[PDB]
Amino acid sequence: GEIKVELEDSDDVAAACELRAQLAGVSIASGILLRPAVIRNATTEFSRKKSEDILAKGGAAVERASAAVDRVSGLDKTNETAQKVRKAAAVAHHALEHVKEEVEIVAKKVNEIIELTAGATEHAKGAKANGDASAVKVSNLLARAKESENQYVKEAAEECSESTNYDVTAKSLAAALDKLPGVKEDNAVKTTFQSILTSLDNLDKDVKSVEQRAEELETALEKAERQLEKAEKAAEEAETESSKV
Numbered sequence: 001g002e003i004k005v006e007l008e009d010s011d012d013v014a015a016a017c018e019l020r021a022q023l024a025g026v027s028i029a030s031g032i033l034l035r036p037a038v039i040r041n042a043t044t045e046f047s048r049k050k051s052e053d054i055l056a057k058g059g060a061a062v063e064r065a066s067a068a069v070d071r072v073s074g075l076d077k078t079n080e081t082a083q084k085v086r087k088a089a090a091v092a093h094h095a096l097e098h099v100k101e102e103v104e105i106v107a108k109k110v111n112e113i114i115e116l117t118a119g120a121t122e123h124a125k126g127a128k129a130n131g132d133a134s135a136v137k138v139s140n141l142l143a144r145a146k147e148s149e150n151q152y153v154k155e156a157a158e159e160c161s162e163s164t165n166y167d168v169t170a171k172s173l174a175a176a177l178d179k180l181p182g183v184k185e186d187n188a189v190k191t192t193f194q195s196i197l198t199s200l201d202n203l204d205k206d207v208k209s210v211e212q213r214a215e216e217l218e219t220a221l222e223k224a225e226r227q228l229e230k231a232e233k234a235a236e237e238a239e240t241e242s243s244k245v
Contacts, residue, residue: 001187002141003137009150009152013142013160014160015176016145018179019180019183021163022168022172023132024132024163024164024165025164025165025167026130026132026200028164029168030127030131030199030203031128036207036210037121038121041113044110044113047218051220052103054221055099055100058095058099059096061235062089062093064238068089068238068242072245081245085238085242089238095227095231095234102227113217116209117210119206120202120207120210123202126199133192134189174197
């Protein structure tokens with residue numbers, strides 16, 4: 001159905017012109033808001049694979065260290081060289097427990113980004129569908145005002161050009177709606193307008209969350225890299241000292 005409230009004066013017409021330009025610009029605003037999460041989400045298979053590579057190198061190192069300990073199992077507790085081997089291998093095992101803790105955090109963040117980006121995608125689709133649909137209805141209202149018997153309304157409606165505002169935010173759209181309280185509350189559009197504002201604010205939140213989980217992911221990969229380095233150096237020592245016998 002159509003908006004039933006009639007634009008009453010020149011200022012209402014100017015406000016409806018601006019509102020229509022904002023509603024028309026919700027589609028591109030939502031794609032701009034979504035863009036970084038779509039880019040980020042596309043990195044995650046690489047980060048996930050990096051964490052998996054780290055785990056495989058860590059497992060291989062610890063087993064080489066464990067093999068070095070077995071080679072010296074015949075040397076007694078007092079043998080200086082066997083002791084460096086046993087201590088180094090214990091370091092490599094302990095460091096691998098932390099590799100695994102950090103790689104688990106990386107997996108958690110990857111899954112969080114996947115979930116948040118799928119939700120954000122749905123918010124952007126909903127904001128676009130409702131911004132496009134309500135823009136049609138406000139455009140109809142402005143086309144009707146061109147036939148108004150009120151000469152000031154008709155004149156203002158003829159001066160209103162079809163345009164898209166490329167800088168729309170939930171904040172600016174809410175300000176534009178609040179200038180036309182009769183239209184904001186009209187049953188043909190009221191819930192549509194509220195859904196755009198909720199969808200854009202959820203989209204914005206979700207993308208901020210994605211970028212925060214992505215920083216957390218990167219911090220854990222760094223820690224996993226550090227713990228891997230410890231495990232690999234300690235395993236090297238275990239092998240090198242084992243070779244001396």
